[PDB]
Amino acid sequence: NLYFQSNAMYYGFDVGGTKIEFGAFNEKLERVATERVPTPTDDYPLLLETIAGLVAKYDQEFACEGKIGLGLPGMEDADDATVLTVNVPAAKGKPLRADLEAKIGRSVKIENDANCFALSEAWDEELQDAPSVMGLILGTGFGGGLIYEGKVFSGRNNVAGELGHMRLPLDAWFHLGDNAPLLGCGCGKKGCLDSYLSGRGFELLYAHYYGEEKKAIDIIKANAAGDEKAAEHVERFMELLAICFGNIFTANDPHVVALGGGLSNFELIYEEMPKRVPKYLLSVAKCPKIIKAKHGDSGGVRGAAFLNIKG
Ligand SMILES: [Cl-]
Ligand SMILES: [Cl-]
Ligand SMILES: [Zn+2]
């Protein structure tokens, strides 16, 4: 079956703290192979050998040299090309790209896993024609990737798309009222979007205004059932998210927004944003298309592979 070749083949590696996932994709961006191997715990020479080994395995299997893209929970330092990460400790501070290239014998592209998610959504059949795609993960945190013409915009410091680490716009702060909580952020700042618009934030906001720790799922369940406190919280949160989106869209004006992560599963978001965002936009501007992510489960490997699509 593998001899039914396209001219080019794209390999994607999603490197996680416990497993490395590989995927091969043809020119139509169809997936033609899948494999997972353990991430070598604290053995960098073995990490390099494992990745190089997969490239060699599939190159022989397809009788061709696939393009190599890799995503990880981290990023490259823009000035010295070493990896910044905590979940793949063996790679921390290492010139991962240069080491792989020397071992494998050809170019490798590396990118943050959330940027890979965004790129994966942007290459879905329905979004391929969108000039810009903003892919955001609302779960553990908030933020993502800015895709232009099917290519990730990394930024001068490889941090473009870190919308989670801008402070709340003033209108969002006023919306929270007299009892608004100033939430700390793990980046070192106070009041970051990451601490309010994430799944974790949704829960902290409920706990702060009602002195009770409920899990997102249960709060959504209570709202659906008709609990008054849950409804008040959902109303508060929906307008907050709309305000923050309005500010973001005024500066970045994306064509389509794709939402991933645990909270992206809360369907009311898709009904509510189109009704609330326009208020916070310039009079001449319309709310972009905001949709639930379609390829979240394999977004890391897909996006990593797609880093090499010739633009
Ligand atoms: Cl796929
Ligand atoms: Cl999540
Ligand atoms: Zn922050």
Distance 149 CA to ligand 2 centre (A): 27
Residue 97's domain spans which residues?
Answer: 1-126+293-311
- Strand, coil or helix: 27: coil
Q: Are residues 145 and 277 in the same domain?
A: yes
Any idea which ligand is nearest the CA of 143? 3
Asked whether residue 205 falls in the same domain as residue 285, the answer is yes
Q: What are the structure tokens assigned to 281, written together?
A: 């936009």
Other Cβ atoms within 10 Å of 293 Cβ, number: 23
Beta strands in the chain (DSSP E): 10-15, 19-25, 31-38, 67-72, 74-76, 83-85, 109-112, 132-138, 142-148, 151-152, 256-260, 289-292
Between the CA of 31 and the centroid of ligand 2 the distance, in Å, is 24
Q: How was this structure determined?
A: X-ray
Task: Please indicate, yes or no, whether residues 166 and 37 belong to a single structural domain of this protein.
Answer: no
Does residue 147 have a known ligand-binding role?
yes
Task: Compute how many other C-beta atoms are within 10 angstroms of the C-beta atom of residue 310.
Answer: 6
Do residues 272 and 302 both lie within one domain? Answer: no
Ligand 1 centroid–CA 244 distance in Å is: 31
Q: What percent of the chain is helix, strand and coil (3-state, nearest 5)?
A: 40, 20, 40
Q: Are residues 237 and 113 in the same domain?
A: no
The CATH number given to whatever domain includes residue 214 is 3.30.420.40
146 Cβ contact partners less than 8 Å away, ≥ 6 residues apart: 118, 132, 134, 152, 153, 160, 161, 252, 254
- Are 37 and 113 contained in the same domain? yes
Q: Contact, 15 vs 39, CB < 8 A?
A: yes
Distance 196 CA to ligand 2 centre (A): 14
- Please tell me whether residues 159 and 236 are part of one structural domain: yes
| Structural domain count of the chain | 2
Q: How far is the CA of 25 from the centre of ligand 1 (A)?
A: 8
DSSP state of 85: E
Same domain, 88 and 77: yes
Angle, in degrees to the nearest 10, between helices 216-225 and 228-252:
110
In angstroms, what is the span from residue 142 Cα to ligand 2's centroid? 10
Do 288 and 311 sit in the same domain of this protein? no
Please tell me the distance from the alpha carbon of residue 197 to that of residue 241, in angstroms, as a whole number: 7
Distance of CA 123 to the CA centre of its chain: 14
CA distance from start to end of the chain: 28
Residues 28, 115 within the same domain? yes
Query: Does 17 count as an annotated binding residue?
Result: yes
**Helix 199-210, helix 216-225: angle, nearest 10:** 60
25 bridge partner residues: 10, 31
C-alpha distances (whole Å) from 181 to each of 138, 170, 213, 241 are 20, 14, 15, 16
Q: Are 240 and 97 in the same domain?
A: no
19 known member of a binding site: yes
> To which residue do tokens 């001449």 refer?
284
Q: How many CB atoms lie within 10 A of CB 114?
A: 26
Q: Are the beta carbons of 290 and 307 closer than 8 angstroms?
A: no
199-236 burial, b for 16+ CB within 10 Å, e for fewer?
A: bbbbbebbeebeeeebebeebbebbeeebeebeebbeb
Q: Are residues 273 and 299 in the same domain?
A: no
DSSP string, 180-208: ----B-TTS-BSBGGGTSSHHHHHHHHHH
